[PDB]
């Protein structure tokens, strides 16, 4: 059951982003939380109001409503009082993790900070794995960064993030998600760079399917590269579980390896 927010409680302030779906605005919301009279929220407005996409919107709203986790973006409800159909999410100050990594890279985020981001993404993924949920498009662009480096997951064919069985057979599983997490690990330690930036969309597919792995990032300790390599086993059965990846990452987050990217 979805919460319904009255239109007069939502005050649009500044457009944050957009896509083919519609636009995302920074907004002030009243009578949402008890302690706060007005608070910043991000509103997704939908371009279409037709029954074909009206039920599809409600499907995402119900799914979003059910998912509740420290590292899954907070969903607050919907406004279906005419068109456009509004979707209210919490406001994450620094936007998507991809922009945040690029803007904080060559001040620049430290190894501990990078491991913290990685650990938080894996935490949200452990939750989805537990519910048998397959994200399908896990990437830093689909993650948001709020106050105090709090990272959460959002936007529930990105072949660059996909494993071989997903590229060739269109098969997405918890194991295909694990591969994508290792690609996301690479993105973090490269400060938001694209997987296979050197290659074309078709050259990358050939590279992935043949069994080539992304080179170890300059700012990536060998211990973290070992974790990505565990995510990139060609056979989905030989890939590490996300619960495992998270726990390994969690150990390095509390006790970061004495590694200086300068030394290599």
UniProtKB/Swiss-Prot annotation:
Short sequence motif named DXXLL, residue ranges = 37-41
GO biological process: any one? Answer: response to axon injury
Q: Which UniProt keywords apply?
A: ATP-binding, Cell membrane, Chromosomal rearrangement, Developmental protein, Differentiation, Disease variant, Disulfide bond, Endosome, Glycoprotein, Immunoglobulin domain, Kinase, Leucine-rich repeat, Membrane, Neurogenesis, Nucleotide-binding, Phosphoprotein, Proto-oncogene, Receptor, Repeat, Signal, Transferase, Transmembrane, Transmembrane helix, Tyrosine-protein kinase, Ubl conjugation
Q: What is the effect of changing residue 167 to T?
A: In CIPA; partially decreased N-glycosylation; reduced expression at the plasma membrane; reduced basal autophosphorylation and complete loss of NGF-induced autophosphorylation; loss of NGF-stimulated calcium flux
Q: What induces it?
A: Isoform TrkA-III is up-regulated upon hypoxia in cells normally expressing it.
One GO location term (cellular component): plasma membrane
Q: What is the effect of changing residue 22 to E?
A: In CIPA; no effect on N-glycosylation, nor on subcellular location; reduced basal autophosphorylation and complete loss of NGF-induced autophosphorylation; loss of NGF-stimulated calcium flux
Outcome reported for the amino acid change (mutating residue 231 to S): In CIPA; following transfection in neuroblastoma cells and NGF treatment, decreased percentage of cells differentiated into neuronal phenotype and reduced neurite length compared with wild-type; slightly decreased N-glycosylation; reduced expression at the plasma membrane; reduced basal and NGF-induced autophosphorylation; small reduction in NGF-stimulated calcium flux
The record places the active site at: 137
Q: Which residues carry this modification: Phosphotyrosine?
A: 259
Instruction: Please tell me in which tissues this protein is expressed.
Output: Isoform TrkA-I is found in most non-neuronal tissues. Isoform TrkA-II is primarily expressed in neuronal cells. TrkA-III is specifically expressed by pluripotent neural stem and neural crest progenitors.
- In chain numbering, where does the site feature Interaction with PLCG1 fall? 259
Q: Which residues lie on this side of the membrane: Cytoplasmic?
A: 1-264
Q: What is the effect of changing residue 44 to N?
A: Loss of kinase activity
Q: Which GO terms describe its molecular function?
A: ATP binding; GPI-linked ephrin receptor activity; identical protein binding; kinase binding; nerve growth factor binding; nerve growth factor receptor activity; neurotrophin binding; neurotrophin p75 receptor binding
- Phenotypic consequence of residue 144 to P: In CIPA; following transfection in neuroblastoma cells and NGF treatment, loss of differentiation into neuronal phenotype; partially decreased N-glycosylation; reduced expression at the plasma membrane; reduced basal autophosphorylation and complete loss of NGF-induced autophosphorylation; loss of NGF-stimulated calcium flux
- Write out the residues that bind ATP: 16-24, 44
Question: Main location per UniProt?
Answer: membrane
Per the UniProt entry, the effect of residue 220 to S is: In CIPA; uncertain significance; following transfection in neuroblastoma cells and NGF treatment, no effect on neurite outgrowth, nor neurite length; no effect on N-glycosylation, subcellular location, basal and NGF-induced autophosphorylation, nor on NGF-stimulated calcium flux
Q: Which disease is it linked to?
A: Congenital insensitivity to pain with anhidrosis: Characterized by a congenital insensitivity to pain, anhidrosis (absence of sweating), absence of reaction to noxious stimuli, self-mutilating behavior, and intellectual disability. This rare autosomal recessive disorder is also known as congenital sensory neuropathy with anhidrosis or hereditary sensory and autonomic neuropathy type IV or familial dysautonomia type II. Chromosomal aberrations involving NTRK1 are found in papillary thyroid carcinomas (PTCs). Translocation t(1;3)(q21;q11) with TFG generates the TRKT3 (TRK-T3) transcript by fusing TFG to the 3'-end of NTRK1. A rearrangement with TPM3 generates the TRK transcript by fusing TPM3 to the 3'-end of NTRK1. An intrachromosomal rearrangement that links the protein kinase domain of NTRK1 to the 5'-end of the TPR gene forms the fusion protein TRK-T1. TRK-T1 is a 55 kDa protein reacting with antibodies against the C-terminus of the NTRK1 protein.
Self-association or partners: how does it assemble?
Exists in a dynamic equilibrium between monomeric (low affinity) and dimeric (high affinity) structures. Homodimerization is induced by binding of a NGF dimer. Interacts with SQSTM1; bridges NTRK1 to NGFR. Forms a ternary complex with NGFR and KIDINS220; this complex is affected by the expression levels of KIDINS220 and an increase in KIDINS220 expression leads to a decreased association of NGFR and NTRK1. Interacts with SH2D1A; regulates NTRK1. Interacts (phosphorylated upon activation by NGF) with SHC1; mediates SHC1 phosphorylation and activation.
**Domain remark text:** The transmembrane domain mediates interaction with KIDINS220. The extracellular domain mediates interaction with NGFR.
What's this chain's function? Receptor tyrosine kinase involved in the development and the maturation of the central and peripheral nervous systems through regulation of proliferation, differentiation and survival of sympathetic and nervous neurons. High affinity receptor for NGF which is its primary ligand. Can also bind and be activated by NTF3/neurotrophin-3. However, NTF3 only supports axonal extension through NTRK1 but has no effect on neuron survival. Upon dimeric NGF ligand-binding, undergoes homodimerization, autophosphorylation and activation.
From the Swiss-Prot or TrEMBL record, give the protein name.
Answer: High affinity nerve growth factor receptor
Q: Which residues of the full protein are shown?
A: 501 to 796 of 796
